[PDB]
Each structure stands twice: as C-alpha cells, then as structure tokens.
Amino acid sequence: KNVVIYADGVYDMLHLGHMKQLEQAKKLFENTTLIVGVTSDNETKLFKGQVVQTLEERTETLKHIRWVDEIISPCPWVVTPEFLEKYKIDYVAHDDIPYANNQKEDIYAWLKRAGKFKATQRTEGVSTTDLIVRILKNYE
Amino acid sequence: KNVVIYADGVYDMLHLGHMKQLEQAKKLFENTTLIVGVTSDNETKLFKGQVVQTLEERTETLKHIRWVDEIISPCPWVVTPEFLEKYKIDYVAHDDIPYANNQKEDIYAWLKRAGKFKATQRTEGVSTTDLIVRILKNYED
Ligand SMILES: C[N+](C)(C)CCOP(=O)([O-])OP(=O)(O)OC[C@H]1O[C@@H](n2ccc(N)nc2=O)[C@H](O)[C@@H]1O
Ligand SMILES: C[N+](C)(C)CCOP(=O)([O-])OP(=O)(O)OC[C@H]1O[C@@H](n2ccc(N)nc2=O)[C@H](O)[C@@H]1O
C-alpha cells in the first residue's frame, strides 16, 4: 500500500501553487513516496522558454518542501515507460491541462490512457509574478 | 535534550533566504522544536512598511516548509519574558543585525544579554524580488 508518485515540472520561482501541488501529489494515497522531477535549463529553453533560475537553484529550493521525498535532477521532458519501470513509479501527477510538445499535442495522454495518471489542481493568482504585480499596484 | 527555538519574522513572499534561516534555526541543536512567529498585518505596516501578503497567506506558505514544527500566527512584534515562559523557549533565532523600533535601538537586546539569542546568517541575492529583477534586467523571457 506504499504508492510511488512522480510529479515533474520546471519549479521556477517556487511559489504556493507548486507547494500545494506537491502536497496533493504526496497525499493521493495514505502512504506515498513523492518523487519530484525538475527539468534542465537547456530542455526548458528549447521547449518552453528561458528559466529564471538554474537547475541547481530550483533543485535547492525544493529540498525545503516538507512533501518531497526524492528528487531527480535533471529529469527528462517526456515520461517514457522505461523511466516508470526504473524508478518503480505507480502514477504521474500533474494538472489536467493537455501539455503540448510542438506537433505532439499532449505528452501526458499516454499515461491517462494507460491508467497511470493522477490529476492535481492548479492554484491561481499566487505565483511569484502575481506577487510583484500586487506591489506595482499598491504603488499607484 | 530537546531545545525549543523561536524564529520570528514577517515571512513575506517566502523565498530561499527565509527557508535557509529556518533550516539553520532548526539545526542549531541535534534535537529541537522550531516555533515560527509570523507578524500581524497592521503591526508590520506600522513598524516596518508594506506587507504584500496577508497574514493568512504568509501562514499558509510556511505550512509547506520541512523545518517548521509550530506556527504562531499572529505573533507579537517584541518578545517578552512571559512569551518565552508561555512556549518554553530556550533561544530566539534571528540575524544579528540590531532591530530598531521607537522605544529601543535593538528589540533583541535583552535576549542577547540574557544568553538567549542564536544568530542565524542572511542569504543575499535570492529574494522573491531579486528573482523578478533577473527577468527585468534581461527581458528575453
Ligand atoms: C516539463 N514537464 C513537461 C516535464 C513538466 C513541466 O510541467 P510544467 O511546465 O507544467 O511545470 P511547472 O513548473 O509550471 O508546474 C509544475 C507543477 O506545478 C503545478 N502548478 C503550477 C502553477 C500553479 N499555479 N499551480 C500548480 O498547481 C502544475 O500543475 C504542475 O503540476
Ligand atoms: C518583526 N520581528 C521583529 C517580529 C521579527 C523580525 O522580522 P524581520 O523583519 O527580520 O522578518 P523578515 O521576514 O524580514 O526575516 C525573517 C527572518 O529571515 C531571515 N532572512 C531574511 C532575508 C534573507 N535574505 N535571509 C534571511 O536569513 C532574517 O534574518 C530573519 O531571521
């Protein structure tokens, strides 16, 4: 009854949305190991856009989060079944929103069809960027 | 054996500096209870300046940090002997820069004289605002 959970992400400018996500992942079953995958600077730039923080920084911050049991740094961009079998992963946690890879429309779709995906919910309006937006409007 | 450490703060827009301070506090001794105090919205505006996040949001964020054993929200601005009595605190953990208000040049002074203060180190250039400065200095994002 100990279920391995893999949640992957850039985890740039770690903020309460990520932390709450990691909490949902950890708490999907009574007993878990939560493995966090953090993407590389270079893949993140190729496929998404430039990263504010290096992989080292993004990895360091996540060590402070209560829910995290293990970290894979760097992690791959797309989840392969070789990868699930290597880290003994039972389910992959991430939001519902289809995640495009330029021509490939949802890199998580295979996992949903395979029965190996658990949806977590986004939290809105608490990003590191929304916080600065509040500062620039209390000025004004 | 078990030592009770009290770290107090605003803990606005929680960032790696804060987390590292808490980590240091927690690890001051082999066995500890880390109690974190989080200041009220109105006292923070009155004694320090704008607080971006409410008391509820600052409290919630700290819920997620590995080192935190207990939170006192809201906490008082100035530590008193009665407060250390109430929670059984051995040491208050904070950076060693004297912290002024209207009445005293260092609100930590009595604890420092009393052998009841543990200095933690600041970590510079990792704040939530410093991160947003790196986006803006290189708008290539
Ligand atoms: C690169 N991948 C495909 C391997 C995973 C990347 O995933 P991502 O770009 O959604 O990364 P991210 O760092 O933005 O999000 C990481 C995790 O944070 C969660 N998240 C993020 C922001 C937010 N406001 N609420 C959230 O719940 C996302 O749902 C995701 O589950
Ligand atoms: C208001 N008090 C007097 C009740 C508590 C102290 O309030 P404060 O203004 O220092 O709060 P703060 O939130 O700015 O910082 C709280 C704690 O994080 C530490 N800190 C802060 C910023 C930073 N870059 N590194 C840190 O180590 C501070 O030294 C302090 O120990």
Numbering used by the authors:
A (entry chain B): 616 to 719, 738 to 773
B (entry chain A): 616 to 719, 738 to 774
Copy the relevant paper text:
In contrast, the gene of PfCCT underwent a domain duplication event and thus encodes two catalytic and two membrane binding domains connected by a disordered interdomain segment. Here, we present the crystal structures of the catalytic domain of the P. falciparum enzyme (PfCCT) in the free form, as well as in complex with its substrate ChoP or fragments (CMP and choline) and with the product CDPCho, thereby visualizing the free and the ChoP-complexed states of CCT for the first time. The enzyme forms a globular dimer with an α/β Rossmann fold that is well conserved in CCTs and other members of the cytidylyltransferase enzyme family.
In this case, ordered conformation of the loop is assisted by the interaction of Y714 with the ligand which is apparently not strong enough with ChoP or choline to render loop L5 ordered. Intriguingly, loop L5 hardly establishes contacts to other structural elements, thus its anchoring to the active site is presumably fostered by the cation-π and polar interactions of Y714 with CDPCho. Closure of the choline subsite in the CDPCho-bound state is also accompanied by the further inward movement of I740 and Y741. Meanwhile, K663 moves to coordinate the Pα group in addition to the Pβ group of CDPCho that originated from ChoP, allowing the phenolic OH of Y714 to coordinate Pβ moiety. The nucleotide ligands CMP and CDPCho are anchored in the active site by several polar contacts, hydrogen bonds and a cation-π interaction of R755 with the cytosine ring. The coordination of the nucleophile phosphate moiety in ChoP- and CDPCho-liganded structures is ensured by V625, K663 and H709 residues. A notable structural difference involves Q636 sidechain that enables a direct interaction with the ribose 3′OH moiety in PfCCT, whereas a similar contact in RnCCT is established by an ordered water molecule next to A95.
